[PDB]
Amino acid sequence: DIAKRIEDGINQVQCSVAEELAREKFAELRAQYVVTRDTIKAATAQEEILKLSEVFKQFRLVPKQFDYLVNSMRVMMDRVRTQERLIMKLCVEQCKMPKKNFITLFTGNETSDTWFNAAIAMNKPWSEKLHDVSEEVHRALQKLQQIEEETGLTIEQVKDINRRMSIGEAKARRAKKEMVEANLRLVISIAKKLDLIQEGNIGLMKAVDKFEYRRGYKFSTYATWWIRQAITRSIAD
Amino acid sequence: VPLDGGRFATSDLNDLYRRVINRNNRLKRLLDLAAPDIIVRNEKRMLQEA
Amino acid sequence: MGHIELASPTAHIWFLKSLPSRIGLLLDMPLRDIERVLYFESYVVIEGGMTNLERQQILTEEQYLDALEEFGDEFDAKMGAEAIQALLKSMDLEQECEQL
DNA sequence: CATTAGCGAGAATTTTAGTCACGGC
């Protein structure tokens, strides 16, 4: 039952990402990959990107490809966070800001180079004399605007996609770390057959994260394979 | 310093250095194989103590 | 002279545990929390980011995982002397001097 | 002649000052 939540998190991360031998599967992707562009170039956009993103999950080729896509979309949020922290060290650091106003100011403007102009409107004597930093604030914006343009996707949806993929990964890792630690007694019992004790649990994580719900050999016995692999040839290593 | 017989007199500093280097080597070898994070927490804390 | 390569960064004790704590006054947290942070038994954030967490806030297991499932990669939190070194390196000097 | 330790080598209270948390008008 616990592996089902991990698979659900994987599906959520896949949805976030997707938002001849290697070509037969890619045919399902390309059957609407070029068909979705004009439909989203203008409702039906969502309706058909659902079908475009669902076929990519029907067949799983390689987890390394998923990791590649993960970091490819991670560099974008990395530079977004870099811009955010740069703006923060310009404003909050040398000023005395409560940092709460950006929820009202920055999160609603983004591309709009008027939030710093509106900072004077609500007093904030540090923002009253923005002056040099104001130029220093929106000069980095002249990086953010074309960054957003080259990304081609809205900032709020970028944040939402990052939030949902982070939620999926966090749930997967949470499940993993919350059910690995309860499997040490079996490791000790099988390793009794301290370096040997530790090499008993080195394969514990492998046998645990490999254990699926479509299995049904006993998980103790299913791990027995890999813990005895340590005794099989690597005991003398 | 060697005293009479095969025994060798030991100083406190050598024992502590041996403990620290043993724990450092253990953590190094254990980390190279990507051990579970629960173990590395205890090993790191005990190395801090050492 | 001899040198030993530590497997991971490790914090000095004297500058931590004098009558005035050097790192304690430099970072402006009580001495109790710093030792807990070093001993890995108390989670601590090093960069809140756009979230509702302070950059220099102390947490625990339940609070961090709850924030982990809420935000996760949005905020950055690491443990131990590694986190301490990271937050020292991220904290500039002259800007703090002029702020004071 | 037959049995077994074994260890060699390897391994796993008084006094004072200062600081910090609570609290009092």
Place this chain on the structure above:
RNA sequence: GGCUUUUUUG
């Protein structure tokens, strides 16, 4: 020759 523990001289 280091440590520890006593005892003693002033």
Place this chain on the structure above:
DNA sequence: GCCGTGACTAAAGGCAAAAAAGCCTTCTCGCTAATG
């Protein structure tokens, strides 16, 4: 709400000499020596 207050914790306590003793982790096994 800031200074008062009490509660908690680090640090040192003579100088030199002599005389003694006793130590420097502990657990485990194969061919040599201890043992029957």
